[PDB]
Design a protein around this nucleic acid. Sequence first.
DNA 1: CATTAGA
DNA 2: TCTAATG
Length: 327
Amino acid sequence: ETLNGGITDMLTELANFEKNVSQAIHKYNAYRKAASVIAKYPHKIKSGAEAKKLPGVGTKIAEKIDEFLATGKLRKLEKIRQDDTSSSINFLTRVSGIGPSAARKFVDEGIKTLEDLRKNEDKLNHHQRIGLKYFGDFEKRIPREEMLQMQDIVLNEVKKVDSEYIATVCGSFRRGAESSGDMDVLLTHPSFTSESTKQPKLLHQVVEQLQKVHFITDTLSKGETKFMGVCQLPSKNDEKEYPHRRIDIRLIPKDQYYCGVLYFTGSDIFNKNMRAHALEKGFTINEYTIRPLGVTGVAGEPLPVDSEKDIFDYIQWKYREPKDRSE
DNA sequence: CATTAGA
DNA sequence: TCTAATG
Ligand code: NA
Ligand code: NA
């Protein structure tokens, strides 16, 4: 957690590089396992060899360990950190809709700078274009202050459109976090569940709504179960407008809410833990359901839920407020 | 790990 | 169709 961090962090530095600049899934996958194990390791790594004993830690990595242990630096790292091309890819990648595949492709073409992108807004697709369009706004955090204003609006329409709607703004937001990245609206409705052959307009109705009013200003992607967009707070009697923000909505079968809701609310750890807990308590929990375990090895049978509570009960736990969903 | 674009 | 990009 700190006793072997540099090693791990250098490792991840390395790893990530292979994945992105180079197209070396393997090496990249190497660095990651290695970083994982060493990370586990209960002692201070003092040398390659000691490291090397490790599973996944070969001669390659060990080698880097020593050089780093010796000189608190690495060349390959130092070389890469320098490398314009590689620096370039790490950056373009920040543009929403820009992957590494694209990042290289763009570079090769010679698009390195943000402006480069602008000069050629044509070589970019709608997603990427909007990505670029709102680059600055997409990088800025979301004050809960705004979260509250945002949430409030979304809820208001949802209800206005159909009273039978169920929405939940999951995430950190939900976990009481002071700020957030983008807003996540978990959606469902009774006329939709596991079997009931859809009702795409169920999704569509709302979206239209939020656009209607002008909260949604753009669509990244819209499918029959997941809308990916950008929204905006109504720049008051201005002198102050609002940054453009990422927003996502997803329709859900009412018979799978709380689970998802459980799940999207997190935290990353709280889940796992809550997840490990169900296992002992004779269960299984995943993004959609909770199913009683059967000794034979595995087992099915999706237990009926009506609130985050049911799930809790099932594994016989303490209701944990979103607030304290921290781990 | 699944859901969307696009080509 | 596959393949990429987001979460
Ligand atoms: Na080994
Ligand atoms: Na990106």
